[PDB]
Design an enzyme around this catalytic site. Structure first.
Site, PDB file in Angstrom:
ATOM      1  N   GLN C  11       6.085 -12.395   4.732  1.00  0.00           N
ATOM      2  CA  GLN C  11       5.523 -12.076   6.044  1.00  0.00           C
ATOM      3  C   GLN C  11       4.735 -10.761   6.049  1.00  0.00           C
ATOM      4  OE1 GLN C  11       8.144 -12.600   9.533  1.00  0.00           O
ATOM      5  NE2 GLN C  11       6.344 -12.601  10.750  1.00  0.00           N
ATOM      6  N   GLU C 247     -10.544   3.665 -14.452  1.00  0.00           N
ATOM      7  CA  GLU C 247     -10.850   5.088 -14.354  1.00  0.00           C
ATOM      8  C   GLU C 247      -9.889   5.793 -13.402  1.00  0.00           C
ATOM      9  OE1 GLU C 247     -14.996   5.613 -13.222  1.00  0.00           O
ATOM     10  OE2 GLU C 247     -14.802   7.764 -12.932  1.00  0.00           O
TER      11      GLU C 247
HETATM   12  N1  LIG Z   1       3.797  -2.729   8.391  1.00  0.00           N
HETATM   13  C1  LIG Z   1       4.378  -3.915   8.400  1.00  0.00           C
HETATM   14  N2  LIG Z   1       5.625  -4.010   7.982  1.00  0.00           N
HETATM   15  C2  LIG Z   1       6.111  -5.314   8.043  1.00  0.00           C
HETATM   16  C3  LIG Z   1       5.397  -6.351   8.576  1.00  0.00           C
HETATM   17  N3  LIG Z   1       6.168  -7.510   8.602  1.00  0.00           N
HETATM   18  C4  LIG Z   1       7.307  -7.146   8.010  1.00  0.00           C
HETATM   19  N4  LIG Z   1       7.329  -5.811   7.669  1.00  0.00           N
HETATM   20  C5  LIG Z   1       8.430  -5.138   7.023  1.00  0.00           C
HETATM   21  O1  LIG Z   1       9.074  -6.103   6.178  1.00  0.00           O
HETATM   22  C6  LIG Z   1      10.395  -5.652   5.871  1.00  0.00           C
HETATM   23  C7  LIG Z   1      11.393  -6.816   5.594  1.00  0.00           C
HETATM   24  O2  LIG Z   1      10.781  -7.829   4.795  1.00  0.00           O
HETATM   25  P1  LIG Z   1      10.504  -9.308   5.440  1.00  0.00           P
HETATM   26  O3  LIG Z   1       9.520  -9.182   6.592  1.00  0.00           O
HETATM   27  O4  LIG Z   1      11.837  -9.882   5.940  1.00  0.00           O
HETATM   28  O5  LIG Z   1       9.886  -9.920   4.122  1.00  0.00           O
HETATM   29  P2  LIG Z   1       9.877 -11.497   3.824  1.00  0.00           P
HETATM   30  O6  LIG Z   1       9.168 -11.589   2.472  1.00  0.00           O
HETATM   31  O7  LIG Z   1       9.057 -12.350   4.814  1.00  0.00           O
HETATM   32  O8  LIG Z   1      11.418 -11.824   3.636  1.00  0.00           O
HETATM   33  P3  LIG Z   1      11.871 -13.302   3.683  1.00  0.00           P
HETATM   34  O9  LIG Z   1      11.839 -13.887   5.082  1.00  0.00           O
HETATM   35  O10 LIG Z   1      13.299 -13.290   3.211  1.00  0.00           O
HETATM   36  O11 LIG Z   1      11.070 -14.236   2.824  1.00  0.00           O
HETATM   37  C8  LIG Z   1      10.806  -4.840   7.109  1.00  0.00           C
HETATM   38  O12 LIG Z   1      11.318  -3.566   6.728  1.00  0.00           O
HETATM   39  C9  LIG Z   1       9.557  -4.754   7.987  1.00  0.00           C
HETATM   40  O13 LIG Z   1       9.382  -3.490   8.652  1.00  0.00           O
HETATM   41  C10 LIG Z   1       4.010  -6.162   9.054  1.00  0.00           C
HETATM   42  O14 LIG Z   1       3.237  -7.016   9.492  1.00  0.00           O
HETATM   43  N5  LIG Z   1       3.587  -4.894   8.881  1.00  0.00           N
HETATM   44 MG   LIG Z   2       9.961 -14.101   4.630  1.00  0.00          MG
END
Ligand SMILES: Nc1nc2c(ncn2[C@@H]2O[C@H](COP(=O)(O)OP(=O)(O)OP(=O)(O)O)[C@@H](O)[C@H]2O)c(=O)[nH]1
Ligand SMILES: [Mg+2]
Ligand SMILES: CC(=O)O[C@H]1C(=O)[C@@]2(C)[C@H]([C@H](OC(=O)c3ccccc3)[C@]3(O)C[C@H](OC(=O)[C@H](O)[C@@H](NC(=O)c4ccccc4)c4ccccc4)C(C)=C1C3(C)C)[C@]1(OC(C)=O)CO[C@@H]1C[C@@H]2O
Ligand SMILES: CC(=O)O[C@H]1C(=O)[C@@]2(C)[C@H]([C@H](OC(=O)c3ccccc3)[C@]3(O)C[C@H](OC(=O)[C@H](O)[C@@H](NC(=O)c4ccccc4)c4ccccc4)C(C)=C1C3(C)C)[C@]1(OC(C)=O)CO[C@@H]1C[C@@H]2O
Ligand SMILES: Nc1nc2c(ncn2[C@@H]2O[C@H](COP(=O)(O)OP(=O)(O)OP(=O)(O)O)[C@@H](O)[C@H]2O)c(=O)[nH]1
Ligand SMILES: Nc1nc2c(ncn2[C@@H]2O[C@H](COP(=O)(O)OP(=O)(O)O)[C@@H](O)[C@H]2O)c(=O)[nH]1
Ligand SMILES: Nc1nc2c(ncn2[C@@H]2O[C@H](COP(=O)(O)OP(=O)(O)O)[C@@H](O)[C@H]2O)c(=O)[nH]1
Ligand SMILES: [Mg+2]
Lengths: 426, 430, 430, 426
Positions: C11, C247
């Protein structure tokens, strides 16, 4: 930004409070519905001091309403402004205090305080920066005297560094409605001297003297007395709600007003006060506003200041006025009356000046006198108390609530200690 | 080149600032939105952005929001940078210890980094102009916190300090003597030239010279700002004898701790009076040696003069100035010390005093600001340490200061250090 | 020539991608349907088909459908090739072992087939740009499955990696420390330069600079993308000192395992401040060395700098940059290692930063992205391995990872390998 | 695409279920006929999570309806939404459970489970990718407690890797309608601790306390309690039906919520909840939504969480809101209340954020608490059970179904083992 939490206890505290909310809603231009309808941006700039924003631009005043009977909640909720308050901040019992301090403090209000205090938390955690607590009550009867000082003790223990600021209507011999008034007040002043940062001592005898000898009202009601109290309640917070040439927070008052920690029992007043048939003939100018404000007739406790000396006076002026003229008049007063101020303080008057006078006034002053003459209000209570206590009159109503006869001994002991500390500087 | 950072602290410093920046904008022809219609004369007080907007080299600091939220809303809201106007949540309550130890302790980090972002934006830097109240909690306690930092971070740079000081009779607070005496370490150790001013002296100047019977603070601040414009005018404009901000100090300050000059301005005059007298260089020079025009309620005839800076501006000529100070040397009531045979530092600048269009003060072709080191000022200290002594003998308000993290011994250590300054000004008169 | 394959995982990586491709389309003048109205500047990021349609060199991968089905339905539905938006049926559940061993095991050979079909359209592919969350199950486990394959399939090619990393206090998951520590083998062994970013640091940048009181993720992704546009700008545009993607690494990376730079961008400013602000080269250079602008919550003053890449873009000149970094070498609070006497790699590019039209970030003539190898980043690792230690001492969630095919010993073998990286960054400071 | 199969058992399970189908049909914009009538494409995008598509764009819910009596099927089929379900998915007996667990598990429902389970197969084979089973039942009485846990055992053995997720209305002393509730619940919790991946503990005492204290309902029906339950059932699956800033599947909840395998008995809640007369006095924003969501008065089991510590809390927010503001509030709660969270987990709060708030709200939050305080719910049942069992009272009704006294000894043994594991981490 310097939020205040306001708390109303018993019939008197809810009546001076429910009038105070009509006064500051007129100032901030808030409708009885809770909507804003005012003229000016300055009315809206500090509305957060006394109100919360709520959905649809309606405003909810940050009041907690406390009673041991439903009938004053019913009288406030049905009243001129009763719809303004949060329905969940009306906290109440069913069986009253019986005009008994020990019912307030140990039984009927000791049950209810767990339901009060957890509402004081929801208002205080919704504040951005709380400056203090503004509690309205009476020292006669049992709800304001005994539950209100229970609640002061609980909020003091939880918020030790915030200002605790109380407006305290209290007993006098010639205007009395209770047999046990002396007992309830002596048990209650024992809590105020230790916990509050300021207590504004108010008397129904002095509020009737203003109505008869200054306003010339033929039949002054409790609604007319509540209007005099609430003018000085709006007065002392003015400098955190409006701009000014000299700003004074409730803490900037306390640092200047209280020389020694316990000498915080003040005596308020207001100017201008006129009959509606003489306002046509008088100038509201700062010298006339000052000659009234320092008059023994204008102050809202029975203590003639001529029976003592002021430690400090604060004059919180409102309106467009000269700082030379204000500083001239606060000098001329304490030099021409020098026998009525303590001579180990080199200037006894604090001044403050707000740019925004009350709606329909060109100028106002709210007066706060810390005076050794306040000994005569605690003395007359303690001497009314003694003649009942020496024969144990009425004590079965208090000891029936599990209170000791030793607690009366100890409260009257602490009352004579408060009198001794004001007589000491006289 | 020739920049000044202007730091406006508490209500008094911010409200004098709101008059200083009202004047500097008129004097340099800058609109209240910071633009300039149609030389680098503005450069001492304003940073020029590439957009063609002049942004003031100022910092405004108050521990409470009310006075700076008014600056953020009034006619100058468009002028200042939105975070050179700095505010806390909590008032200092006329308590030095809230300003210094408890409340100002939090905001100081934001203030000092916003000063860094001005000082790193100056190509060279002449000094600091620090405006405050001696009687305030923010005025005394926050200025003394800030100066201690600026005196380690900018140790070489001249710190000029404009102080509204307690009066003989006029006072707004009970604890004004405590806050002022606790400030005396700041001015002695962490300041280079400290201009004491008094509300009661300007109230009397307003009554006698301006014909205004009952003045506000706006009338006072329009006189206090006119002095700093006249101190800085040689830094900003062409003159016959321009004075640098350290050239000023090399003639004012005879000894390291003897840096508390009086100040005065002439002609303070109503526009209705100014038609019926000619206001020559000799008249406005003699006006500076009247007790009637001193902006601290002390009498210069009860002292001796150590040095005078006569900073003239407008249509004045060195002939007239030498001929004038020759009459001041002839008068036996104006007594200099035996060790200053020269006495006078003269500055002459070609730019007349600007009139604030809403103000009470006349258009005049000439003015002088006289800045004057004299033994007489020790009486304004002898007044206030006698107010302190009555209250400290009772410990009359001391629990509010001890309750907010101050050592009780600092009151004795401050009354002691003031007695050593009041000793030094008596010692050098002989 | 000069292609990059951008792989957006989970995500966070997909939502950063939805900002990156929103930016690259504006910056190259490509419509959201992939067409271009009226130079090969787009060629690094877009393949061009004979219809005059520019198709992005990107792969989007998620183990669940929800976020990529939104990309397949929103304004960019016509930009991407429909089979390089890749989805599974089953969420990775914030479990590394579902991403790596059980669920991602099925989609991987389809993800590789798209990356092969993109690389076969390149001619001198420059590297990979891999975007992910360290805390996610897909973010940690699927990226670590993919990188192990790309590091045998494309062993020579530079793998740049942009990671959303766990904060000091802000967290969205209980198991965020487990997924992050299990990822540390990926970054150490199968990455060439790994840009850690923190949600809590950008939330504070947003609060202080932009004055946006309460930001979403769309506000964070519009800064994380702005860094990758500024890294890639030398690959896409003309400049005075263009920097190649190797670089860059030859100046950033002093030792094989010491490839975890901080990153920061200046100016972060909004329209209400840009008009009062100075925005010279010296100011935006000094803003990169403030703790207040670092996008990981660690203090650079608790470290030493090994190397800085100052990648300027827009209207700058090498005079100004040399004069600016001379002041940074003068300041004793910005401390480099004894063994890097040169310290700075400078890049300068003639293309200003693009404004996304819905964004808080202002139009500015200049920007700099500073990418900086410093010993300080080891504190962001010391925070998170102390979160890991409390939970692994209880085996607090370990049955979910052991239950999905992971060896229990991999948790010890990952905490061990992190302690050897946290050792290496302390060892080289001396 | 992450299909759910939903199963309703006994009177309570079919009543909280038949209300749940009215709530999620309003969300997805499905008419009581089964035809789509909604506003938005997002309502239709994940309709497959809870429905089968059919001819004419009619949608049939993927529900199985189980009872041992016809009268609840007759009450559902005739009800507000009764026509929507598949006629073949109503699976029922004729003679009831007699409020007997052993009739449910061994006799009356052991006959019927062969006819239930083969319908659960037709729905699970019609799924594209099944994520789990969502079973509604009660632990008192005999159908939900004894047949529902028979059915959990059969579906667990057949689908070992899919999420088994149960919503379980369960006994309490002050709101009870059965003598043999403690027996039935103790025999049933013994199956839930081994087989389910999540069990959401719900109490009629807590559901009435929410109706009285905070909704201020004049007379709360079972229809009003079923509305509170079904709000949290719609809540926890939201992130597989709608888009969001942070997506959380039922498995992404379980991995974060369940530290040790058996500690999966949660305590749900919902916000905003507010009396119909007091909505005008409120701000809906995330800071105020949070201070309700963690209030001991809002959770739907009788436990005060202040008698324990949380292991994990999940807050599944819905609506347009800031991630800074959500991450700020979920930090501020567990730092200001740090004595109520276990200190061997470094962050106790999971967050999720959906872009689509419930119809007629600007925001909503569904709360899930795993707390050591749930020991109080199993302790009070085990102590009621012990008093009846120490004298073998009512056991001829269970041993008449061929159940052993040894199975009561073993079920209460396993109940005290569940209490000991929650007390251990406190
Ligand atoms: N800046 C930012 N941080 C994000 C965003 N979406 C998720 N995060 C960060 O993603 C972290 C957790 O990872 P997930 O969003 O659960 O990652 P995922 O790969 O989708 O995990 P799974 O659902 O298990 O597959 C959190 O600490 C969030 O703050 C986004 O659009 N922008
Ligand atoms: Mg995920
Ligand atoms: C034309 C004119 O001059 O009208 C005056 C007036 O005649 C006099 C007599 C008013 C009037 O006061 C009374 O009648 C009165 C009666 C009993 C107790 C107290 C007051 C007045 O009603 C009161 C009213 O004051 C206000 O409206 C203030 O804003 C006041 N608020 C209220 O009184 C109020 C009333 C209803 C609802 C909400 C607010 C206030 C005071 C302090 C701080 C905040 C607000 C004023 C100026 C007047 C009238 C209308 C005649 C006086 O009161 C004040 C506070 O000014 C009484 O003596 C003063 C002098 C005034 O001259
Ligand atoms: C004009 C206005 O603001 O109306 C609100 C309302 O006044 C309040 C009081 C509603 C109202 O709730 C109740 O009356 C109620 C009574 C018993 C048990 C539960 C609720 C409301 O009826 C409930 C109703 O909620 C919904 O429509 C939700 O989408 C909800 N679904 C249903 O209630 C529903 C009802 C019939 C048929 C199908 C669905 C939902 C909840 C969780 C997950 C998905 C959907 C709403 C917003 C309101 C009214 C109408 C007054 C409240 O409930 C909700 C869920 O918002 C009770 O406290 C909240 C705060 C709301 O402001
Ligand atoms: N001339 C003039 N004097 C002022 C002005 N404002 C305040 N003063 C003087 O300031 C002195 C007291 O200091 P304060 O105004 O209370 O200073 P402060 O820093 O705001 O004090 P705190 O509220 O405690 O923070 C008084 O003696 C006033 O006469 C002004 O605008 N002009
Ligand atoms: N000013 C004012 N005084 C009141 C009011 N009502 C009662 N009082 C007086 O002050 C005392 C208040 O006591 P009360 O409030 O009745 O006791 P409680 O209800 O037990 O706290 C009474 O004896 C009255 O003399 C009122 O509305 N205004
Ligand atoms: N919330 C809710 N509780 C119910 C409902 N009907 C019954 N209950 C309560 O919970 C228990 C449910 O048991 P029941 O469903 O009757 O047993 P079963 O039919 O044999 O499974 C009863 O004793 C009631 O106290 C209902 O519609 N809603
Ligand atoms: Mg101040």
């Amino acid at each position: 930004m310097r939020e205040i939490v306001h708390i109303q206890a018993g019939q008197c505290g809810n009546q001076i409070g429910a009038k105070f909310w009509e006064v500051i809603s007129d100032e901030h231009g808030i409708d009885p519905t809770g909507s804003y309808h005012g003229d000016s941006d300055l009315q809206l700039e500090r509305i957060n001091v006394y109100y919360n924003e709520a959905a649809g631009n309606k405003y909810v005043p940050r009041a907690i309403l406390v009673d041991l009977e439903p009938g004053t909640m019913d009288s406030v909720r049905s009243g001129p402004f009763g719809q303004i308050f949060r329905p969940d901040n009306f906290v109440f019992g069913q069986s009253g205090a019986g005009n008994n301090w020990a019912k307030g403090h140990y039984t009927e209000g000791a049950e209810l305080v767990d339901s009060v205090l957890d509402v004081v938390r929801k208002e205080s955690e919704s504040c951005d920066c709380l400056q203090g607590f503004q509690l309205t009550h009476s020292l006669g009867g049992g709800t304001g005297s005994g539950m209100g000082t229970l609640l002061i003790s609980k909020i003091r223990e939880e918020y030790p560094d915030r200002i605790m600021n109380t407006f305290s209507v209290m007993p006098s011999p010639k205007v009395s409605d209770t047999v046990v008034e002396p007992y309830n007040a002596t048990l209650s002043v024992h809590q105020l001297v230790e916990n509050t940062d300021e207590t504004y001592s108010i008397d129904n005898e002095a509020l009737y003297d203003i109505c008869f000898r200054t306003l010339k009202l033929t039949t002054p009601t409790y609604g007319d007395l509540n209007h005099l109290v609430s003018a000085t309640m709006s007065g002392v917070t003015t400098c955190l709600r409006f701009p000014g040439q000299l700003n004074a927070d409730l803490r900037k008052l306390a640092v200047n007003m209280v020389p020694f920690p316990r000498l915080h029992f003040f005596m308020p007043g207001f100017a201008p006060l006129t009959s509606r048939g003489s306002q046509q003939y008088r100038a509201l100018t700062v010298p006339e506003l000052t000659q009234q404000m320092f008059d023994s007739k204008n102050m809202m406790a029975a203590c003639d200041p001529r029976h003592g000396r002021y430690l400090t006076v604060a004059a919180i002026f409102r309106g467009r006025m000269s700082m030379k003229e204000v500083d001239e008049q606060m000098l001329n007063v304490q030099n021409k009356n020098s026998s009525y101020f303590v001579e180990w303080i080199p200037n006894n008057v604090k001044t403050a000046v707000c740019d925004i006078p009350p709606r329909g006034l060109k100028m106002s002053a709210t007066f706060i006198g810390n005076s050794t003459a306040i000994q005569e209000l605690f003395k007359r209570i303690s001497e009314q108390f003694t003649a009942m206590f020496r024969r144990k009159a009425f004590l079965h109503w208090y000891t029936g609530e599990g209170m000791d006869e030793m607690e009366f001994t100890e409260a009257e002991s602490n009352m004579n200690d408060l009198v001794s500390e004001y007589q000491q500087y006289q | 080149m020739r920049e000044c950072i202007s730091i406006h602290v508490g209500q008094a410093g911010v409200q004098i600032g709101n008059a200083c920046w009202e004047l500097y904008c008129l004097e340099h022809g800058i609109q209240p939105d910071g633009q300039m219609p149609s030389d680098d004369s503005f450069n001492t007080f304003f940073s020029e952005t590439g957009a063609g907007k002049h942004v003031p080299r100022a910092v405004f600091v108050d521990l409470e929001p009310t006075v700076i939220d008014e600056v953020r809303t009034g006619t100058y809201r468009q002028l200042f940078h939105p975070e050179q106007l700095i505010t806390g949540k909590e008032d200092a309550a006329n308590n030095y210890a809230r300003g210094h130890y408890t409340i100002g302790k939090e905001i100081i980090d934001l203030v000092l980094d916003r000063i860094r972002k001005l000082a790193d934006q100056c190509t060279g830097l002449q000094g600091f102009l620090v405006f405050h109240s001696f009687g305030g909690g923010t005025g005394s306690g926050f200025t003394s916190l800030l100066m201690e930092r600026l005196s380690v971070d900018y140790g070489k740079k001249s710190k000029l300090e404009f102080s509204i000081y307690p009066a003989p009779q006029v006072s707004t607070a009970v604890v004004e003597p405590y806050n002022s005496i606790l400030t005396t370490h700041t001015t002695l150790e962490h300041s280079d030239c400290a201009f004491m001013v008094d509300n009661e002296a300007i109230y009397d100047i307003c009554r006698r010279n301006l014909d205004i019977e009952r003045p506000t603070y706006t009338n006072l601040n329009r006189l206090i700002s006119q002095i700093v414009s006249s101190i800085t005018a040689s830094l900003r404009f062409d003159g016959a004898l321009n004075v640098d901000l350290t050239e000023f100090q090399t003639n004012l300050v005879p000894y390291p701790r003897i840096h508390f000059p009086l100040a005065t301005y002439a002609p303070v005059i109503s526009a209705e009076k100014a038609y019926h007298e000619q206001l020559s260089v000799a008249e406005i020079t003699n006006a500076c040696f009247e007790p009637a025009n001193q902006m601290v309620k002390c009498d210069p005839r009860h002292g001796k003069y150590m040095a005078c800076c006569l900073l003239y501006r407008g249509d004045v000529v060195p002939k007239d100035v030498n001929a004038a100070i020759a009459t001041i040397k002839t008068k036996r009531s104006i007594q200099f010390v035996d060790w200053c045979p020269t006495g006078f530092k003269v500055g002459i600048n070609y730019q007349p005093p600007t009139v604030v269009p809403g103000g009470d003060l006349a258009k005049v072709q000439r003015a002088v600001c006289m800045l004057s080191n004299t033994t007489a000022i020790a009486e304004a200290w002898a007044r206030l340490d006698h107010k302190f002594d009555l209250m400290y003998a009772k410990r009359a308000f001391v629990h509010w200061y001890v309750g907010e993290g101050m050592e009780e011994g600092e009151f004795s250590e401050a009354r002691e250090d003031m007695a050593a300054l009041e000793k030094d000004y008596e010692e050098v008169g002989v």
